Give the backbone structure.
Amino acid sequence: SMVIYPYKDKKPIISDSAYIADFVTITGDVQIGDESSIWFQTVIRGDVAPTIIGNRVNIQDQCCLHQSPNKPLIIEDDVTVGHQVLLHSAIVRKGALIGMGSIILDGAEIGKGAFVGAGSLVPPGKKIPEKTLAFGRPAKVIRELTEEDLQDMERIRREYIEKAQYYKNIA
Amino acid sequence: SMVIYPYKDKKPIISDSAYIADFVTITGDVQIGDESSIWFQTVIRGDVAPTIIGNRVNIQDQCCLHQSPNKPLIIEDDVTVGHQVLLHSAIVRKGALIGMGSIILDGAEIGKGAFVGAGSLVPPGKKIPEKTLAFGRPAKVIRELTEEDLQDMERIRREYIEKAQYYKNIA
Amino acid sequence: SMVIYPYKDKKPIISDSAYIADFVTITGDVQIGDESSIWFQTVIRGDVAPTIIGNRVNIQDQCCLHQSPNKPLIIEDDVTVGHQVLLHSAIVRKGALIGMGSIILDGAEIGKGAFVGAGSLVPPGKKIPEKTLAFGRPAKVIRELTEEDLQDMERIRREYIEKAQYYKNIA
Ligand SMILES: [Zn+2]
Ligand SMILES: [Zn+2]
Ligand SMILES: [Zn+2]
Ligand SMILES: [Zn+2]
Ligand SMILES: [Zn+2]
Ligand SMILES: [Zn+2]
Ligand SMILES: [Zn+2]
């Protein structure tokens, strides 16, 4: 099962259609939208600044979501966050994908439909342009995404919505 | 206190001599062999492609094992997988060691008895030659392993068999 | 909601003023000091060499603390260890900060009040001088810390003590 705690005057607001997996911790000022999914072992501590997660977002296994003072963690609709990602006061725009094993730091902004490659580091305040591939440590813009890249990102988002409904039933 | 779930027509097949630690998640199409050990907080989701783990394998704490479509995750006998490793449709051949904090990506093949150094990234489709030390991001061959290296690899594998037997009793 | 196990003749010695979060695993030869905090999903296995954690230390979420033979894991007073850090037989001196997503390897020594930047790797046996900023893979010394840097390090340490007191009460 999972752990959900208040932090002072703030308690998590989680959509009835969201999936919260086993061994998940969510605390404090966290909002999670419709058909979104928080996968096994993930931690979302909403005790420094607001956390706002949109609709149809998947936050994959063993992620850590946290904030620095006065820097909200904002994850817009249709975002995929890969396994073992660290988001710290990141702004992640609609339909972006954060490659598994990446670290996204304070104030960093990931543009709409951008792809951060696996294992990347996006340093504080850095902006990744919309619909680009960026990877490395620190992440560099590599190229513009193609329709093939975008269709793969759409497939993963849809697959996670379905798998979330399957596991929510099994649990 | 682990969680074991079926996925559609597949349920995990785990040897009676395996150790499954607390807070472990294992789902779907997963086979785990004799005397293998899956350590605290590890996630193995067998919901995209088959996962086959051999005998006397240790998968250390906080690992994440997953697949991409049509790319099986294969971990052969006598493999050591270090703390906090991400394996995504990796092929890890007999007796290899995956250094703690490494990321091994889709269709990457780790040669028999190879040593991937701590903190490495092996990119999709990349092959690490048998019995080499390779490290970095991306991982580069450094040297051929010596008898001293092989004795260290033997010690870790045998120590994890003994620790797994101890904790299985304590749990 | 935590797991605490002995290892042979050693059981963890944890101060009554320490906070041990949910889904934490602590085993064996581990000492944790006064007003220290071990955050969600962290693993501290004290089964290879001694682990000594001082007073007012925060070990953030999803950390893994382990040892190699004959190399104690030493974390002195007033240390901050960031989210998703791996410490393996590290020596971390008083008031140092280990940036989130870093890996500190066997016999590496982090000098008093030093700052290891997020996402860094400190290789085995490497020393980071007192009161410096170091980052990268492997970590390079960049500059001497300023009073502004030290005040940021003090703010984080003090904020964690108080939050630890809050969650310990809620739990
Ligand atoms: Zn944080
Ligand atoms: Zn046997
Ligand atoms: Zn995956
Ligand atoms: Zn063998
Ligand atoms: Zn990690
Ligand atoms: Zn034995
Ligand atoms: Zn270890």
